[model samples]
Target chain A: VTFLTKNVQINGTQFKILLQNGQGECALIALANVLLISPAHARYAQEISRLVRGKETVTLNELVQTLADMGVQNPNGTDVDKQQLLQILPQLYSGLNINPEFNGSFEDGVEMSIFRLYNVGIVHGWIIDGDNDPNSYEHVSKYSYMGAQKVLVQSYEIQKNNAQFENSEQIQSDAPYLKSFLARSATQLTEYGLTHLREILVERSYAVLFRNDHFCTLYKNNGELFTLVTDPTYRNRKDINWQSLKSVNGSQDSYYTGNFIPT
Target chain B: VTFLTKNVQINGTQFKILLQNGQGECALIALANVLLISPAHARYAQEISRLVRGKETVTLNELVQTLADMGVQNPKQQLLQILPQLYSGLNINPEFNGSFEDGVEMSIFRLYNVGIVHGWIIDGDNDPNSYEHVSKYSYMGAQKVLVQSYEIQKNNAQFENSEQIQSDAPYLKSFLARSATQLTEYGLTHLREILVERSYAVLFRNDHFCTLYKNNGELFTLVTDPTYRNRKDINWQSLKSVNGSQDSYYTGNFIPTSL
Candidate 1:
């Protein structure tokens, strides 16, 4: 189990914590907060925001393109190599480290698998963090809750119809990989006697989570036991006791333990 | 000839003249200055700029998309109908009006035909206006000069080899129409003993000029003559010596059009 020891400064130079001004922008904001860590990164982010202006949601390809535009450069500085950059990011950014021990297993629980992939974990936390202000909890909660609701609804639909789920073309392109993840999680849920909807949510969440970090401190206190320190204002500060936190698949005592050191 | 009586306020609400920060953005800045007249337009411009942030140049189709993104709306407000909006812009924006009488005629000269199309004319002037400041002339001149050089070089290439000129796919899609315009102007230039490169340049300039407004005043002075008043500082102020002014095709007294 991990307990936050101190507040972590996730934002780097020129990186600003942007609150979502519209619905379905949690993912976009999450990526921006992580990737736009330098002045050059912020400038590129501004340009990308213009390109996708008015779009409520963005695809993985778009996110990848944003990253490429920010960092990928040729010797002449005339072109960007997106694919190359995608491969380089996990190694280049310390926040993106993935745990080698993690494997897609029923006992691994979706939440734990996600935490093992550092980039996926940080993005998830940031999405949950929102504006990192205590007052923003209600506003951010609605969107985060909506995200879970969407997962539940989608899972139910996919189960009832037994049909391929439709998504953006970019997302659909990864159907094989995503479908397999879903299938495996569905099988695991059956063995555990979990609801199909919950199973689907956990699997889908796990699949997307792996497909995608930052740092925060973990510390232990006497009464609370474990806490996550994210923001200086204690706005996104979260505290939980052992065996109390729950996973999407109804797993109990599922917790994350690790040290996050920036490279 | 059209003469300016007063300074025209081309910019509307929230519209500000933006200078090109990098090369090959004259067209983008020109379009932005004209289209971004309202606060909503400005916001959409901000978004569209983000989309093509690193690109120094934008295509006509991209330009159309930006316009549609800014204004196109369905009854449900869930989608943007780009094509419908593209058709709507010339009518909706007063600055986009095209002249009904102009045709692809060589004697018309590239400049005159461009002026007839109200939308095309305003954009041309704005490209020349950049930042609407006087000192901007030196900065804007380099780009405007580059635009002229591009046309000259492209025309030279076409004349030397008689091969198809290459451009972006979007531009290439309009090849038949563009080729016809170039051929007609080339024939006209030959009749007048003009250089193939110069003729091609004029025609190509005229062709592109039409393919792409706002108001500014024209004033007639006593001696120096034909002054254009754009920015308040008149930094972009030009006092052309009429007969001395030259066209790519070496035509004289090939001035503009009627009101």
Candidate 2:
């Protein structure tokens, strides 16, 4: 896939990438980019989005399992293996403006599943960003989110709204994903001393970057100096300076959190 | 195997129970009191506590499996029968100070059962220190720990002599009930009575159970060491239904005077 390098602006900072904009399926596409499963796998993910129909998102494990069941090559495993499934867990938690006042009307949107996946990953002893494998991208996956190392090359946008509000009709955009937080059970993320994430990201592997209203994949471009990002947003797979991105990315209300490595 | 009721005070209300001062095993003791599982079962629970010692608490399914593996009847299956361990997170901010840790209803139930299993062993074994170090921190405080007792007080207090005849509430009191059944007109009538008289309600969601207390005549939901949301009343009816399961309740059984 092409790594776009056009200069871009975010909260007044200069950076560059071939801006791929507004495919809400950034998380899944990012996984596709890194895992590089199969054409069939990518095709089925579109099917998954279609099945959920913009209401709820299914887990990657569920996607992998369904495809495997349909007699295709399952990159995850023959069956759903917890040990391996956990290696790619993205860290996340409930975001804001959704659950107003613990009113029992909290819609989780995409964040809850992201958090749930990480917790099970923690108990199972998986790392946030996995260690480098000589076989996979000369150890890029190790520092990459969920050991992902490439800009997943694809275009998709089945007619579906990924947001909670139906104000704008959800077009069949190139990005298919679970958007719009649905009022579900309230959830919380246990602390792993992650207050200093900026320092920690440089210390460790690629983090599964979560946003206040969106999701993306994050990795260091080289030697933890530059930040690489793959967003489902149209034409936006490129790099951002870590420090500059920190102010624009991480926040109490929202920002990157979940990171896991192979057990 | 006895109930002791010396009047106790909480806020301003005078309450009474078998006072066993300075123990974190209130949860376990209460479980044994109601379920009447054998001494063998209680001891196995202690062993379970020991197994989880100095580590994060476990699921109720794990506890049930361990006891069953150790050759004791699993009362949770024969009795409560809310199969499949709960998975969703419960937001709890225990009003108690210091020991407040955030967890879902399932995790809190696990912690409470850990307290119970360890407490029972402490009472019987004489070697209390063996379990004290790991268990002391297990309970942040007594009020926070006893969130599971309302179920025990309801079950054990209902029958005078045997399990055949029991206190059927003026409202519908089905032998088996849940949120859908309990939140109905009949269920609300009995729930109000229990909350007003006993000052606490026994609530079930998924396969896990916890307690509810009165906050200025409104229901305040609880799970030990839970996420602290605003100090406002979280509606029990709205919260009971989880993961597509209809789970809710409040008991009409009188708290046993003594045993």
Candidate 3:
């Protein structure tokens, strides 16, 4: 019965957050919402977001201090706990050639697991009395959302050579990532998308809120917010079981531009 | 006497289109350029800024269609010739994370003949006589330009690893791709920057149009462009001396800002 009711706050403002699971080897983004987690603890992140709405902005220094109070050895030593994550994130996007086109930021590529992400629109929040009432805002998680820091997608098998999906020999590089660019239909899901999304679930944590098979809004947890999204096994759990201790680094992207001449 | 002219009014134009030597296979951007070139050529792009500066348009197609009436080629297919040359180029910039905060777009990458780019600005013109003279429109090649498509950039060494120079490794499927990516400045010369205003000798009808050694643009007719560049090895006879038919397959890309 441990809902994610705890989160770090700064100046009494709510910010969507991500917990990077770089295993204490990275620096988290300042005022950023993504906390990249390990493939195992990704579910914990969804739970954390569901319980807290991920509307908390905690700086690296504050996070270090908190771990210190909890009796975690030498908290300052880990003050830059997520340095590696931040360092590698921008590099990863550069390597993939995505180039932050969608504004995806990262803490580090070495420890890309478990990052926190909040939309620029939701960075600011007012400290209302409801901050103290967890039950009152339990539904906020249903609406809370994070921006896609990274998206990787491809076209269908038949359209694989469409140049929109990239060169076939090259498409292999984009195995599993963000799903913003590709056209996903219920058929893409009921058929192969399910297996594909599951494979994604096996890799990363937290399915940044998505509707219609495309990334929609981040998950929320307030009154009527996320009342129906508790099932974390076959459906939501398959894509966003934040309690499962793992996430399927789910995302994809495609373009309308053509590459080759028609044969 | 040799200016790459493109006009649409006089039916079409003629010009030797040079492409980078990709060693048998085609460059990725070449296909993209073909699509762009076809349309741009059809529609008189724009006149040379020097001639019809603020005029309508002028393109390779206009230049070809117009030149064709001069008995070059009837259907204009014969004028579409690609001169393959071996040249290289790479974009250089500061690092993004540790070395430099230069964002990805500002990042640098070395292309081993991966992309294609020519050295000049070609605009279109609608009226032929009212259009500009071809002599006043010879495109200046190799002006130290860099061009990437507008879609987006990926996280790779091709975009921002040129400063590393010698240490970068070639891309491989194994775990080695990481090493290749980190040390991005692997092979600097094999890039797609094929056309050089100052590199090789240009030939028209087996005659010299231009030849470059270091910083010179020597014209034919026993004279040269004012650039004062000289490569002694450049001789019109060399072209005639080549007896056997010389044809090879390769790949490269088109000029930047493609369309």
Candidate 4:
């Protein structure tokens, strides 16, 4: 009778997310969460994965190649810069290709599903062979569509470009209020760091915090800051300090700074 | 209310299978086909994948690892042999492995309940542009009843849960086609005749599962697939062995039914 249950608040908005199984597809699954926020993206998932090359999966090389093939350009290598990655993400969500030169680790090894996530905005995992086959796990199967809609997606206007989001503050102020996280960036050290981080954290927009190597969904905490953080490898969610967002990327020296909007 | 209808002849028997969508995980999906034949397996699929290590597809290596982790053993190479592993639920029967090329057939039988239906034909969605699209077509009738009944009888100790119905014509006469009882060998030939007469889709120990319908000339041809190879008209009246050659054959006339 009711289509809603199990709600968690992120920033000032309530959000829901499916937990990732212990697989190396976090980035792919995380993107799924992003698409799941709205019906349009969810529908896009069906289109993207429908034509995917693999039954249950798309290979990393296929993914990188397809991205390049589909018009996501990274002239010299397979890796796209942050801005480039954002552009690519939305494309993958739409139904999405490419063979391009590359270097470094699995630069070619990105999952095709990720590209599909951006291009078509949808995708599905291979769970059954035939329509009549037994549904070994009807209630809680592993594919992305197994569960009913559980949470509201962060509604944001799909801009023709990320150009308008000129600053992190702009992105926060325009936060969909569904669920938010800091995107990829160098963790910066401010003469008055947490002060600045707290400034952004003020409206309870970024409820969660964590390191780039790993991050969490922003859940509510004290008026000061509430965050949803976790080990990327594990499937559990934990709440940590809002101050947790400030530590310098010890290895990089510089702090993590997200580039949500283009300059 | 009729639970059975669209029937095709394979070898000397009639059979049906769910066509795969040509998705890369043919093995997994085909295995799903196997489970759909029976309610029990259908229920188990959800349980099986509920905690699977991967979100979308479970690679062969990962499958092997999961099997081992779940207690299946193969020493090394992470390969899956027959029989023993079939019971493990990884569904890698006869000879299925990690490489995408390997797991195909074994995945089919694993679900058919040969430990296995008809049913629908699965093909890629018409979006011919992409590679993994899925398209589904329906058969005139469902094979659920036939396949499930075959399972109930096959699991009966009298039959020792045999994957083949190869004894004699007696199994056919008793008509021990009870949906909820063990089929004692006493009905071997009887069941075989009916099965071979109205063949249910079946799976061998590790070999692929197909139908054995007879052609107009009365010769047998193994209707080997929903979409595999050499699936066409054949003379089954002359053929006696399942492997297509008399010298080597495990068991024939495989059948399962629903309750």
lDDT of 2 by residue, A1-263 (tens): 22222333432433232222322223333333322212223443444333333322223434433432342223233444343333233222111111211111123433333323321111110121212222222222122111110111111111111333332232212011110011011111112112233444543244444332233334432233122333433233223222324222123122221121111
Q: Which ten residues in a row have the lowest lDDT in candidate 4 chain B?
A: B133-142
What is the per-residue lDDT of model 2 for residues B56-154, given as tens digits with 9 covering 90 to 100? 223243453343334333323332222111211112212111122434332434433422111001111322432232223222121111211222232
Model 3, CA-based lDDT: 0.22
lDDT of 3 by residue, A1-263 (tens): 01111232222333333332211101222112233222233333344334335334333434432322232122222443443433334432222221111112222323233222221111111111223324322322112111111111122221222444335453323311122111112111222323333433322123332221111112221111110112212221222322221112222211110111111
lDDT tens digits by residue: candidate 4, B178-230: 11111122222222443433332332221122332322322232322324322
Off by over 4 Å in 3: A1-195, A202-263, B1-259
Off-target runs (Cα >4 Å) in candidate 1 are A1-15, A36-68, A74-263, B1-259
Q: Highest TM-score: give the candidate number.
A: 2
At residue B62, candidate 1 shows an lDDT of 45
Candidate 3 chain A: minimum summed lDDT over ten consecutive residues — where?
Answer: A254-263
Each prediction's DockQ?
0.01, 0.01, 0.03, 0.01
Q: After superposition, how far is residue B140 of candidate 2 from its true place, in Å?
A: 30
Q: Once model 3 is optimally superposed onto the true structure by TM-score, how far is the C-alpha of residue A64 displaced, in angstroms?
A: 6.3
lDDT of 3 by residue, B119-173 (tens): 1111213223212321122111000101121112222325343432111111111
Report the lDDT of model 1 for residue B4: 19
- In the range B1-259, model 1's lDDT, one tens digit per residue, is 0111212222221222333221111222233333333232454455443433443233244444444345433112221332322221211111111222222222122311112222111122423332132212221122222223233332332233123222221122122112221222322222233322111111111112111111122211111011322332221211122121321110011223120
Error of 2 at A77 (Å): 23
lDDT of 4: 0.27
